[PDB]
């Protein structure tokens, strides 16, 4: 009777509490998505157990074995019932799983160390002094791999061959690299993560330029799940009653440090 | 399958949320006891529904009809399964219901408007310029009614006959009366409520002297309930893991205004 909710350790969506060692189950974790999962489960009327995705990935299909990994894989293969995470709504995923209407809007964005002479993707593409990269897996990397726009094709060509590799395993690693590189590394990531980091000490990063696209995160379920409808209606209610905005303020801005 | 939890509207234990009009069920309320009920239900493993006691009372037995009113009555007559509230552990109640070990320690205390020339119960008892009273019903009034200590007998004799009546219907009314009386009214109430008000604007009240007694609030259940053991063990765990102290800080001090 207990619904398995897959999620991913990513600040400020899901994080361990300070004393998690003496805590069990859902209590171990806190964050925006922990709060959102509680709200969904309240309104859908289900008991639930949070489960951190074993492989720490969002979800992509292996071109060789055709196997889905990450949170998407957990849903595809029936190991989880719902995903509550900053999981981007994309065509290739919508082909295999279902998504609620968006609970958060975002776009791909550029993170620089303050003072770096870059104001747009065009600025990055036309030079080589400042390296740039994305998460080693995820919808951002796929944006560049799949683009047919000249500027982004140029960026993908550079990123694919750059050494040392410009691809990072986690968002935190990419951020660390921006901070430690004296302005010679810029990180391509979602505007939501960018905005969060901008409000954290040492306050040495910034989001520059407009977003490169417009999309959203959705709460995901397996195709044909009997929970899809109620989850979607819950998300819409939470939006219209101002909860989603409240939670965004709680985890991004109310706690700000800059 | 849903356990009925009786409680009482008393700040900061239980209060309506700003938007309660668009909210249903437990979501309507917030406060220390709302948080405590959630924690108890999590650890005891039950679904639950908060229910504000209809008559707004804590619990006393009518000397005429022998009927128990308030939250105690809800438990005695089977209309609620648990009470989570600032309900004082007393002999006469322990005769009819069960209580967990204390989740909060307290004592009877004196609230004055700042500048009032009173430092103890003795100071109040020996004069008449400054009126004083208690909640019109509850364990504090019963303390004075039942005492055989000369000072408290003197106070009860005064309070019983004073006009205009010195007894108030709610804690809030007693507080208002202290604030509006230019130092000519002092209010006898539990140290917990006193400490809370002391940290609220206009910051014009204070707790004076030591406490008159030492007791505790407990989570209550009907005699012989199958939930009594697990509730008691939950309360002890919450105490030992520092949750109770955290919640006290959250609702009394972290939000302070003085
Ligand atoms: N939200 C992305 C992960 C982060 C990124 O790609 O930058 C996804 O669902 O794959
Ligand atoms: N906690 C008290 C109510 C407040 C008071 O008596 O001052 C009771 O359980 O009756
Ligand atoms: Zn750990
Ligand atoms: Zn809600
Ligand atoms: Zn109302
Ligand atoms: Zn707990």
Complete DSSP assignment for A46-71:
-EEEEEE-TT-----B-TTT--B-HH
- In this structure, are residues A5 and A51 in contact, taking their beta carbons and an 8 Å threshold? yes
**CB-side neighbour CA atoms (13 Å) of B65:** 6
C-alpha A211/C-alpha A107 separation (Å) is 5
Assign 3-state DSSP to chain A and report helix, strand, coil percentages, each to 5. 40, 20, 40
C-alpha B65/C-alpha B62 separation (Å) is 6
The reply to whether A22 touches chain B by the CB within 8 Å rule is yes
Rounded to the nearest 5°, which phi and psi values hold at B29?
A: -115, 155
Identify the nearest ligand to the CA of A86 by its number: 1
Question: Residue B82's CB: how many other CB atoms inside 10 A?
Answer: 28
The reply to whether A241 touches chain B by the CB within 8 Å rule is yes
The residues facing A111 across adjacent strands are: A187, A207
C-alpha B2/C-alpha A255 separation (Å) is 36
C-alpha A106/C-alpha A44 separation (Å) is 26
Assign 3-state DSSP to chain B and report helix, strand, coil percentages, each to 5. 40, 20, 40
For helices B139-146 and B150-161, angle between their N-to-C axes, nearest 10 degrees: 120
Domains, chain A, ranges and CATH?
Answer: 1-106+216-255 (3.40.190.10), 107-215 (3.40.190.10)
C-alpha B176/C-alpha A146 separation (Å) is 68
3-state class (DSSP) for residue B242: coil
C-alpha A79/C-alpha A234 separation (Å) is 23
Which of A22, A29, A35 would you mutate first to test chain B, the one with the most B CBs within 10 A? A22
- In this structure, are residues B205 and B113 in contact, taking their beta carbons and an 8 Å threshold? yes
Identify the nearest ligand to the CA of B85 by its number: 2
- Select from A19, A22, A241 the Cβ nearest to the Cβ of B22: A241
Contacts of A242 in chain B (CB under 8 A): 19
Total length of chain A? 258
Rounded to the nearest 5°, which phi and psi values hold at B201?
A: -60, 145
**CB-side neighbour CA atoms (13 Å) of B136:** 10
> How far B2 CA lies from chain A's nearest CA (Å)?
12
Question: Residue B2's CB: how many other CB atoms inside 10 A?
Answer: 9
Experimental method: X-ray
Query: Of A204, A9, A247, which is closest to residue A255 (Cα–Cα)?
Result: A247
Q: Which residue is closest in CA terms to ligand 2's atom 10?
A: B138
The residues facing A83 across adjacent strands are: A6, A220
- In this structure, are residues A177 and A185 in contact, taking their beta carbons and an 8 Å threshold? yes
Q: Where are the beta strands (DSSP E) in B134-208?
A: 185-190, 205-208
Residue B68 DSSP one-character state = B
3-state class (DSSP) for residue A87: coil
C-alpha B132/C-alpha B154 separation (Å) is 12
Which tokens belong to A81?
């019932």
Rounded to the nearest 5°, which phi and psi values hold at B3?
A: -75, 130
Q: How far is CA A8 from the centre of its chain?
A: 9
* CB neighbour class for A209 (10 Å; exposed up to 12, middle 13-18, buried from 19): middle
Q: Is the CB of B140 under 6 A from ligand 2?
A: yes
Give helix then strand counts, H and E, for chain A: 10, 13
C-alpha B75/C-alpha B82 separation (Å) is 7
Contact A27 B42 (CB under 8 A): yes
Q: Quick one: resolution in A? A: 1.8
- In this structure, are residues B220 and B75 in contact, taking their beta carbons and an 8 Å threshold? yes
How does A46-77 read in b/e, with b if 16+ C-beta sit within 10 Å? bebebbebeeebbbbbeeeeeebbbbbbbbbe
Which tokens belong to B37?
């009920």
> How far A227 CA lies from chain B's nearest CA (Å)?
20
The reply to whether B27 touches chain A by the CB within 8 Å rule is yes
Report cis status (omega within 30 of 0) of the bond before A202.
yes
Which of A2, A17, A26, A27 would you mutate first to test chain B, the one with the most B CBs within 10 A? A27
The reply to whether A27 touches chain B by the CB within 8 Å rule is yes
The reply to whether B245 touches chain A by the CB within 8 Å rule is no
C-alpha A176/C-alpha A187 separation (Å) is 10
Given the structure tokens 């939470």, which residue do they identify?
A: A238
């Amino acid at each position: 009777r207990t619904i398995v909710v897959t999620t991913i350790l990513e600040s400020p969506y899901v994080m361990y509490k300070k004393n998690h060692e003496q805590l069990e189950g859902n209590e171990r974790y806190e964050g925006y998505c922990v709060d959102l999962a509680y709200e969904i489960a309240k309104h859908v009327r289900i008991k639930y157990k949070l489960s951190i995705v074993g492989d720490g990935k969002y979800g992509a299909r292996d071109p060789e074995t055709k196997i889905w990994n990450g949170m998407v894989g957990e849903l595809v293969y029936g190991r989880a019932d719902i995903a509550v995470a900053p999981l981007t709504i994309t065509l290739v995923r919508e082909e295999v799983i279902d998504f609620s209407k968006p609970f958060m809007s975002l776009g791909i964005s550029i993170m620089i160390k303050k003072g770096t002479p870059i104001e747009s993707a065009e600025d990055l593409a036309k030079q080589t002094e400042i390296a740039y990269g994305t998460l080693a897996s995820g919808s951002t990397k796929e944006f560049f791999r799949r683009s047919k726009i000249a500027v982004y094709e140029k960026m993908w060509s550079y990123m694919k061959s750059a050494e040392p590799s410009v691809f990072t395993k986690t968002t935190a690693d990419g951020v660390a690299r921006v901070r430690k590189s004296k302005g010679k590394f810029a990180f391509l990531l979602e505007s939501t993560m960018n905005e969060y980091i901008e409000q954290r000490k040492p306050c040495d990063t910034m989001k520059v330029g407009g977003n490169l696209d417009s999309k959203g995160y959705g709460v995901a379920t397996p195709k044909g799940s009997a929970l899809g409808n109620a989850v979607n209606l819950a998300v819409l209610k939470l939006n219209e009653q101002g909860l989603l905005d409240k939670l965004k303020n709680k985890w991004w801005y109310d706690k700000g440090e800059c």
